[PDB]
Every structure is written in C-alpha cells, then in structure tokens.
Amino acid sequence: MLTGLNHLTLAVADLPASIAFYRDLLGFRLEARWDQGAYLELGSLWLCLSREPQYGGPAADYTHYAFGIAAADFARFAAQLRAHGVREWKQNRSEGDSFYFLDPDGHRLEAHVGDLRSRLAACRQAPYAGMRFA
Amino acid sequence: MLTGLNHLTLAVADLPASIAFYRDLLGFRLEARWDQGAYLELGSLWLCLSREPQYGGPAADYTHYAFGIAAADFARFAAQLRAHGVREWKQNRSEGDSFYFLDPDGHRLEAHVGDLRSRLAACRQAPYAGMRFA
Ligand SMILES: C[C@@H]1O[C@@H]1P(=O)(O)O
Ligand SMILES: C[C@@H]1O[C@@H]1P(=O)(O)O
Ligand SMILES: C[C@@H]1O[C@@H]1P(=O)(O)O
Ligand SMILES: C[C@@H]1O[C@@H]1P(=O)(O)O
Ligand SMILES: [K+]
Ligand SMILES: [K+]
Ligand SMILES: [Mn+2]
Ligand SMILES: [Mn+2]
C-alpha cells in the first residue's frame, strides 16, 4: 500500500531566495543544498526545492500547501509575515485560524490551527452542503 | 514554530473522478464528501480535493507530490497503475525506486521507496554537484 506523504517538491525560479524564505522566514531546517536544489525538513515533512529558472509560478487555482501551527503562535506568525511584506491570497472562512500567503514563486501556502479531526468535528456540528461522513 | 504538513489541497475539475482515483487506485480513506470537495487520509496525510470545474491542470514544471511505498510492493504498484492506463510524466533517475504518474487533472504524483534519510545517506556517498550538507 502507499504509506503517506513521502515528500513535497516545489519548482523554484530563484533557488537562493526560496531557501532563504523556507529556512529563515518559515523555520524549515536546511539539510542539503546543491547547484540545482535543496532538501529541507519541517517536523516529518521532507520539502525539496527544485531549481527551474524559467518557472513562472503556478496556475491560479485552489491547490495549496498548509503547515500546522499551535494556537498560541498563530497571531505572532501572521503578524511577522505581514510585517515582512508577504502577500496574502485568501481570507480565512473555515474552522480554525488560517493565514494564507504566497511563497516567492507564488506557490500558495497556509499556516493553520487545527487538523482533520477538528475539521470533521466542526463539520458534524455544522455540515457543509451535501456533506456525508465516511 | 510551524510543525509540519497540516494538509495538501488539490484543485480538481471532476470531484467524483478524483475521489475514486485517490480512494480506489491509491488507497486513501474517504472521510467526508460534500458538493464542493472531499477530505481523505493516507497515513498521516490529510488530502483535500477542492472542486474547481474549470481547472485545466497545473503548469508544466517540476512541482510534484510523492507518496511512500515499501520496496517489495513497488513493482506490483507500478505494474497495476500502468495496466490501468495511468500516464507517466518522468523516468526515475534518483536513489530509490520511483514511479512518476499523473492524476486525473494532471497533478504530478510519485510513488517512492526511501525517505529523506536514505536520500541524504546516498548523497553523502555520491554527492550532487555542489552539494553541501548540514
Ligand atoms: C475553494 C472554495 O471557494 C470555497 P472557500 O475558500 O470559501 O472554501
Ligand atoms: C482544509 C482545506 O484546504 C481547505 P481550507 O484551507 O479552505 O479550509
Ligand atoms: C528536476 C531536475 O531535472 C532534474 P532530474 O529529474 O534529473 O532530477
Ligand atoms: C525527492 C525530490 O523530488 C526529487 P526526485 O523525485 O527527482 O528524487
Ligand atoms: K481555516
Ligand atoms: K527516486
Ligand atoms: Mn487549506
Ligand atoms: Mn520526487
């Protein structure tokens, strides 16, 4: 069977800028760097940055990558990145604090308080349209 | 500060088709579905499918999502998805077996044997160009 998420790989046009963003601004640990990429870790997440100098960023769509944060740290994180001029791409509407921000290439990120279990519980108490649980 | 990956959200043009692909071909568990999305889980991975009917699939770039698989299971998985007519987008060149295939929208997926530690260990015996390690 498949076991989970093994790694997330992001195309990046400016590898140095993306390393700085994920490591220095977001707190990922840089584990390796080479002329065409970097490997970083956050908790159990393996992030690969693959250098693609002609990359123009993603299509405009809902695809996005959310990282967890503790409730007590949310407000400070959102304020830190806002003060650092990071661009937002969405305003939170769903259960649990969320800050929706763009990376240097325009990959859509989120910092979120909550998990699947808190989402399903909130949803059972107030179901989305047509919602069915399984 | 940030703790890891909280969830992966994919834009999907055809929500029923994507549910069946992730559940039935890739073995995710369907936890909830509503008119505009679904929540699934594989291991610790929270996958959200967000219905976006005019989505045309991603840009052609290196961005991709890899799921783990055990060495002994690899060949059967690759064979099964090929027999089912899944399209491939890349040929493996790096440490650990990998099968690189597209989802119904063209999101780039991978089934991979190994992890960050096995990659780092392999890279230290045979480093990529310019490679430096923490
Ligand atoms: C992605 C779908 O538009 C909705 P939401 O952002 O309000 O959940
Ligand atoms: C959890 C799923 O990504 C959606 P939301 O961030 O709009 O709640
Ligand atoms: C994504 C970069 O082209 C390289 P590789 O696929 O050989 O690692
Ligand atoms: C692990 C990083 O995604 C790259 P690869 O799949 O080309 O090895
Ligand atoms: K939210
Ligand atoms: K590989
Ligand atoms: Mn989200
Ligand atoms: Mn990969």
**Ramachandran quadrant class, A109 (left: phi over 0; alpha: psi -120 to 50; beta: rest):** beta
Nearest to A6 by CA among B99, B77, B45, B91: B45
Cβ of residue B9 lying under 6 Å from some atom of ligand 4:
no
Ligand 1 pocket (Cβ < 6 Å) reads A 62, 93-94; B 50
Which ligand has the nearest atom to the CA of A114?
A: 5
Option in A3, A56, A128 nearest B68 (CB):
A3
Experimental method: X-ray
Query: What secondary structure letter does DSSP report for A43?
Result: T
The two beta strands, B98-102 and B88-90, are: antiparallel
**Ramachandran quadrant class, A106 (left: phi over 0; alpha: psi -120 to 50; beta: rest):** left
* A71 alpha carbon – ligand 1 mean position (Å): 22
CA distance linking residue B23 with residue B18, whole number of Å: 8
Q: Do A69 and A80 meet the contact criterion of CB atoms below 8 Å apart?
A: no
Query: What secondary structure letter does DSSP report for A50?
Result: E
At residue A18, what is the residue type? S
Task: Name beta bridge partners: B51.
Answer: B12
Say how many Å lie between the first and final Cα of chain A, rounded: 20
Query: What CATH fold (topology level) applies to the domain A1-134?
Result: 2,3-Dihydroxybiphenyl 1,2-Dioxygenase; domain 1 (3.10.180)
Ligand-binding annotation for B110, yes or no, is yes
3-state helix/strand/coil string of chain B: CEEEEEEEEEEECCHHHHHHHHHHHCCCEEEEEECCEEEEEECCEEEEEEECCCCCCCCCCCCEEEEEECHHHHHHHHHHHHHCCCCEEECCCCCCCEEEEECCCCCEEEEECCCHHHHHHHHHHCCCCCCEEC
- Our mutation pick for probing the ligand 1 site, out of B50, B51, B54, B55, counting the most ligand atoms within 8 A of Cβ, is B50
Partner-chain contact A39 B120, CB within 8 Å: yes
Q: Do A65 and A110 meet the contact criterion of CB atoms below 8 Å apart?
A: yes
CA distance linking residue A35 with residue A45, whole number of Å: 22
CA distance linking residue A90 with residue A88, whole number of Å: 6
Option in A59, A73, A132 nearest B58 (CB):
A59
Q: Is A110 a catalytic residue?
A: yes
CA distances from B9 to A12, A24, B15 (A): 19, 25, 13
CA distance linking residue A43 with residue A29, whole number of Å: 9
Cβ of residue A50 lying under 6 Å from some atom of ligand 3:
yes
Cβ of residue B9 lying under 6 Å from some atom of ligand 2:
yes
Q: H or E element: which one contains A39?
A: strand A37-42
Q: In angstroms, how far is CA B46 from the centroid of its own chain?
A: 12
Ligand-binding annotation for A95, yes or no, is no
Angle CA(B22)–CA(A63)–CA(A93) in degrees, nearest 5? 110
Resolution for the entry shown, Å: 1.2
Nearest to B120 by CA among A98, A37, A97: A37
Q: H or E element: which one contains A119?
A: helix A116-125
Rg (CA), chain A: 16
CA distances from A128 to B33, B35, B50 (A): 9, 8, 13
